[PDB]
């Protein structure tokens, strides 16, 4: 199975979602404008080929002995995994190449949120690409190529590695995160069409014409205290959400799709805090992934969610919901460590377009 | 999707099809008492069971007591039991505890001194291990979690490495996996299937000196760092002569087929495989089971890549090491490196659901 890379908004959106994630931001090193845009232009043809389950350049192999791969290879044999390929724009990006004035109103930044305990090191980036797929071999051989293609223009800044579900799992049934609680119940889909124009694209109206077609998205790597997590009663598992774990059901009611009363969940519950009702419509696109990278110098499981949210505008999406998640009781068992906006471009039309070239021309 | 047999003559995980995803983890021991150590393996081999099944440990995830914690994490809910496989080890600092000195095998050798070895000692080494294999990572991180939550004051998780990918084979039958340097890794191993090159090459027999080890293994996992930007700059023609395979279809140098036998002498005297092929090596043969790993980025601009290594023997002094030391001049050094050892002696299988693991030592 393959995901058509072409169209009005970039794939890995709206998309259907993958099993794998690698998150990767990028930093520019080069002030050349002319050379950057090159980079995009040969970024977007090594993406054509990796989304169709092509080695990118001349091939992986058969080429001159003498002259290194234009493919490292390892994706070899391998499907097209519905692999997308998502670039996105920080917000440092555009102090460079004179793009200062073209950066959006809606590319907001973060205001600093009750127990953030921020990497700069995970954190911020000038771009990213999100790749997703249901290898997880298939989109870490597109970072690293699309690395090595951009070496001397970028470098890697941070990586994420992500898992969800693994399809091969019914499908419509919802991935738990790796507290033991369904995850995505009440999100958008990618088949509300109506929803995605009014919370997640970008339109011509909102200020920024060259991001038409676009949408925003906020990264934020949340470890997840698993030891003390554990250690709760699944009462308190319970409360501290509001739904039931078995089910997912929200409280007082039996199915897992049965929409919430919140007034009967605790006042601080998450999703009491976190629904739309809570923050004057406030509605979001979730498309994060669960990760695990270790363990840290105590013993205890480097585990959590990589958040992602994708919305129409910054400031009027995961800022008022995380803002209203102030007291939110979760927040004893979860720490934002990593975070990063991104703008991110319209699609790419046809065969003849690039990423970012409504922004650069 | 289906479940792998938890009990046998031997331990699964090591003959095993290899599966997609790897949770390894190492655990030091933390207690003194013999009989709470014993009564932890029990523990952990009834919620081994429970897990390799598809079926939550203890009581369940949910519908227990309210006000008490429960059994099972719940992560797991709604999975099938993706192929998971629990394999446990025994590091020889173990036999440190519980009296279990003159018990140790003298097959659990320590490692010597390699040149390159940059060994990071806090990912090296462990009173044990739990090497958790399946499809799904969620169903081998919640093995893992649920160990070690059960074992908690009583050990603690040393280290632990994740594998995305598998960069081996038990099963020739299948598509050999690639590692990160793009080459087909797992061509010339032991299959599942080779009952009679297990017994010769992997499982320790009776007459080895070590009876409670008998239908055991003995482990060497070691965490091997790649330069891939070194490696991303050389010449298709020097990767392949780093190996003596081509790099498309995997077959040695000057033959047409990735299962073609090898003939050495068209190989560099420093290709990897002339000098890892048993031929070269009296004969030592190994089964490697390691797995890709991608632990983020260096600080250094660049993708953090490596390969988990890991080998299953009869005898660590006749099988890895051996090998190990003849790759000395081996070309590939110049893009690897050494950072992570152990060693672990792999007791034999649990036998049926009255068994443990490692009663044959305690029991
Ligand atoms: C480790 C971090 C988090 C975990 C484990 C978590 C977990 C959950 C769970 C179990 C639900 C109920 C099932 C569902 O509808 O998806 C939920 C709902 C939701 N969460 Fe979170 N969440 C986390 C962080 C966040 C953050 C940082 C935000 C926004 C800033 C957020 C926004 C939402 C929203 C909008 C909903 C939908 C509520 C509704 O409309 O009913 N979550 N989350
Ligand atoms: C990053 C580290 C390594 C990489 C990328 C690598 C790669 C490869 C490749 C491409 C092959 C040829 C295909 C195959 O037969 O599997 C191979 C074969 C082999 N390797 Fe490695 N290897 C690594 C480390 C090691 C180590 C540390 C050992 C032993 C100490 C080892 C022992 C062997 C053996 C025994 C074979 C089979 C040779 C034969 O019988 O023809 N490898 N390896």
Sequence with gaps: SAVPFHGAHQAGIATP?????????????????????????????????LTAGHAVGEGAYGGLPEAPPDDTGEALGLKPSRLTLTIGFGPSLFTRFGLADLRPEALADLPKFP???????????????????????????????????????????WSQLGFGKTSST????????????????????????????????????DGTPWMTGGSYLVARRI????????????????DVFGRDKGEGAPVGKAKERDEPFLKAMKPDAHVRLAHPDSNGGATLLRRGYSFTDGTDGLGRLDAGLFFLAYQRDIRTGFVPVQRNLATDA?????????SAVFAVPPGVRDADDWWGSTLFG
């Design 170 to 205: 019914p499908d419509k049934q919802t991935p738990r995160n790796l507290l033991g609680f369904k995850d995505g119940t009440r999100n958008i889909a990618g088949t509300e069409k109506d929803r995605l124009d009014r919370f997640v694209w970008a339109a011509e109206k």
């Design 223 to 238: 470890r997840m205290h698993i030891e003390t997590w554990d250690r709760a009663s699944l009462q308190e598992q319970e």
């Design 330 to 338: 979760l927040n004893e068992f979860i720490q934002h460590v990593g």
């Design 115 to 157: 127990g953030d305990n921020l990497d700069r090191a995970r954190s911020g980036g000038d771009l990213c690409v999100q790749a997703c797929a249901d290898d997880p071999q298939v989109a870490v051989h597109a970072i690293r190529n699309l690395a090595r293609i951009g070496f001397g223009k970028v470098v890697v800044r």
């Design 17 to 49: 979602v993958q099993d794998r994630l690698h998150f990767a931001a990028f930093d520019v090193t080069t002030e050349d404008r002319a050379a950057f845009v090159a980079l995009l232009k040969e970024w977007t043809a090594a993406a054509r080929r």
